């Protein structure tokens, strides 16, 4: 039935006079797929939506929200497109030169070089990494700290009742905000940014976002056993739990 739904979009996109209904329905369809984490499904739909839809449509409470929801959804997708690239890279680290104990004088020199070339690649694989870390992070904070009212949260409050959508928007927050936090923690930990890891407890507990309400009690503790792990590595470095110099 996947196709039935992703195909009803091209029918609504064809007629430009129904772009407001095409987007709204595109949202709904992408709300079902997100709850299943079908990101190639959600995105295959996301491209069918002409890149210039938003511009033309220009506002009923149903169109202000669907424009916001669409960008929220793009903010979410882009937060998985850049992580899978980053993650793919983290798993392609240059491998150490192989050792040939009891080497011939030939094998000694081939190895002096293979050992010197590797000490060039590992520097760039931290180079490319840093730039894929700086980018995946930004996206994770665009979703977690979504501007003007939080992620998947309507700004317009005068639409007509849509319990399906509304409760789909509360759910999407409880499936994906705990899951984006845990990823960002995994990104920060993987790159050794431990001080910042611990600063996820400010972001989450914050009264500005009230992200902690989107967490189950279990997920919290789990995030608290994740942070205590970053803390350790900060002690091993000689700093206090939170990364500040011990005077």
């Amino acid at each position: 039935e996947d196709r039935l739904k992703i195909d009803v979009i091209d029918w609504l996109v064809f007629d430009p006079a129904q772009r407001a209904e095409a987007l709204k329905q595109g949202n709904a369809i992408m709300r079902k797929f997100l709850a299943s984490k079908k990101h190639e499904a959600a995105k295959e739909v996301f491209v069918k939506i002409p890149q210039d839809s938003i511009a033309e449509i220009y506002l009923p409470a149903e169109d202000d929200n669907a424009i916001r929801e669409h960008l929220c959804i793009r903010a979410y997708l882009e937060a998985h497109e850049t992580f899978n690239e980053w993650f793919k890279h983290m798993n392609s680290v240059p491998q150490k030169p192989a050792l040939i104990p009891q080497p011939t004088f030939t094998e000694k020199v081939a190895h002096e070089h293979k050992e010197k070339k590797y000490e060039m690649d590992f520097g760039i694989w931290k180079g490319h990494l840093d730039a894929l870390t700086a980018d995946v992070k930004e996206k994770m904070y665009n979703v977690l700290l979504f501007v003007d009212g939080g992620w998947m949260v309507d700004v317009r409050e005068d639409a007509k009742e849509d319990h399906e959508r509304t409760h789909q928007m509360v759910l999407l927050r409880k499936l994906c905000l705990p899951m984006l936090c845990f990823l960002l923690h995994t990104i920060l930990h993987s790159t050794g940014q431990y001080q910042e890891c611990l600063q996820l407890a400010d972001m989450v507990s914050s009264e500005r976002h009230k992200l902690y309400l989107v967490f189950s009690k279990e997920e919290l503790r789990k995030l608290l056993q994740k942070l205590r792990e970053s803390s350790l590595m900060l002690l091993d470095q000689g700093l206090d739990p939170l990364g500040y110099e011990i005077q």
Binding site: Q51, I54, A55, Y58, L59, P60, A61, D63, D64, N65, I67, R68, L71, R74, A75, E78, A79, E81, T82, E85, G127, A131, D135, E138, K139, N142, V143, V147, D148, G149, D154, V155, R156, E157
Partner: protein
């Protein structure tokens, strides 16, 4: 169009969608017409507000980078392109631009070298690639000959 045509449309969608989020989500489409009416200090703030709510749109980010390019603010324009590129890797032409601008402004930092390498592998041996290779070297006679 004129100044009246675009600033009168403010009251057009203001009377159709008044909440702050939808008011800011129309910033890109507000800024779409100020770029046409030759208003770049104004268009800048319109797009920049849409970026405040739609921070993951590669089109909007690039549009601001292209607007900072008209403003000749290299540091600001480059950063905008970077965001659009990191969001969407298929924007090859922006990888050239970043490499093109990094080599023109300052070569002292290796970041200009890095982006030039990528630009090369996206456009194998294009006419612009060598042009950038010569630009980076510019910042001696025997060196150019080699």
């Amino acid at each position: 169009r004129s100044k009246a045509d675009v600033e009168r449309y403010i009251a057009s969608v203001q009377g159709s969608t008044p909440s702050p989020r939808q008011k800011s989500m129309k910033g890109f489409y507000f800024a779409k017409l100020y770029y046409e009416a030759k208003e770049y200090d104004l268009a800048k703030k319109y797009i920049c507000t849409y970026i405040n709510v739609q921070e993951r749109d590669p089109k909007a980010h690039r549009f601001l980078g292209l607007l900072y390019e008209l403003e000749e603010n290299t540091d600001k324009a480059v950063e905008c392109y970077r965001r659009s590129v990191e969001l969407n890797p298929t924007q090859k032409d922006l990888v050239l631009k970043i490499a093109e601008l990094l080599c023109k402004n300052d070569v002292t930092d290796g970041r200009a070298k890095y982006w030039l390498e990528r630009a090369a592998k996206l456009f194998p041996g294009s006419p612009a690639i060598y042009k950038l290779k010569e630009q980076l070297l510019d910042c001696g006679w025997n060196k150019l000959f080699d």
